[PDB]
């Protein structure tokens, strides 16, 4: 009775970071070894002993950001993505996996489908999700839902070109949160 990890990693479409997707994992047997021997994951950091420990629930978060933005997916980090899109807590107990996806996420002429949040009044508390499209009032005058001067649409596009530097290339990210509660654990290994 295996876990549906194929649904998360091998999916054809990933969500954009501002609308990062969350899949709940429960009541299955997970094989975590395939991570280590992959040797094709550019980022793999935890904050090998996974197959022996069980948890009541597992939460897999997935999205796409730039290469040089992957460093922001870590406890106590700052930046556009960490402040306005996806914030990891300080007490974070889990792992972060990321890999280059230029071949299947960019295209000649540019892929403008992956978005990111550029403006917000406050910062995001850990694991908060903001998907609002409210026009950002940057000036001292009301916007009334009309774009223009000092009134900006809060979401901007990435624009993934196949010929960009690795920093400006699309990268798919998976964040595994391990949850332990007063309840029977339902996600184990061998």
């Amino acid at each position, epitope marked *: 009775n295996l876990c549906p990890f194929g649904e998360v990693f091998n999916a054809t479409r990933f969500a954009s970071v501002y609308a990062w997707n969350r899949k709940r994992i429960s009541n299955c047997v997970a094989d975590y070894s395939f991570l280590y021997n992959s040797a094709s994951f550019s980022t793999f950091k935890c904050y090998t002993k996974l197959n022996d420990l069980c948890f009541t629930n597992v939460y897999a978060d997935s999205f796409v950001i730039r290469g040089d933005e992957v460093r922001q997916i870590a406890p106590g980090q700052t930046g556009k993505i960490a402040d306005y899109n996806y914030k990891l807590p300080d007490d974070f107990t889990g792992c972060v996996i990321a890999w280059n996806s230029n071949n299947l996420d960019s295209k000649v002429g540019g892929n403008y489908n992956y978005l990111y949040r*550029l403006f917000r009044k406050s910062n995001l508390k850990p694991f908060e999700r903001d998907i609002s499209t409210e026009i950002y009032q*940057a*000036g*001292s*005058t*009301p*916007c*009334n839902g*009309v*774009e*223009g*001067f*000092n*009134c*900006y649409f809060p979401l*901007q596009s990435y624009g993934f070109q196949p010929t960009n530097g690795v920093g400006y290339q699309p990268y798919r990210v998976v964040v595994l949160s391990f949850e332990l509660l007063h309840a029977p654990a339902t996600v184990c290994g061998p």
Partner: antibody
Amino acid sequence: VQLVQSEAEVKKPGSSVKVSCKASGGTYSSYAISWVRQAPGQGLEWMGGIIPILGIANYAQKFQGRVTITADKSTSTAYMELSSLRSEDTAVYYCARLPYYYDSSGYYYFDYWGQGTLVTVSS
Amino acid sequence: DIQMTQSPSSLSASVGDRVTITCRASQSISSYLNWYQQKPGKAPKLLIYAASSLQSGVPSRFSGSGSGTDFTLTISSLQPEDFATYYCQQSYSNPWTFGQGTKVEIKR
């Protein structure tokens, strides 16, 4: 001179034109660059703008789907491309500059205008 | 869409006169009002921003007053290089709107 524009253009109806605007300073700093046109014997009309330091572009409702304003930080040159040109589009296109007015927390006046680029659209 | 309406359309004056140009907004815009000068063939030049602040490099004889819906551009002791068209423009609400202009011509 603080902003220089490309020379005049003549375009057949239905084609597209791309006008340039170079900042004589070297960079954009925190300035905003907007495009305002003036038809023969008419007033001024805002069409769109860009804030290069932020990477944002807005456009007037009259020009959605036809205009695209871009910026190149390396050359410190701003571009405005207007598609599907019509006889009514024959006008002088100015690129104007807006500083961040701290006392009102935004861009609220045009500080310098380019000489203007004449675009003549006719069959 | 705020409609700025200027008065008068034309004005005939002599050198050394006190000239006042009034600009009325369809609704209150606080002090988000700018005055521009434009001469035939040339680009517009900023004169006054924030209804009353003088743009550096403009002679002190240019002064803006007013707030809310009524504004005034004042030129004390008109000079020869001041015969031109003057535009008022509001920055309160998008889209930004200009007036139809006021032309100051030599009187003879």
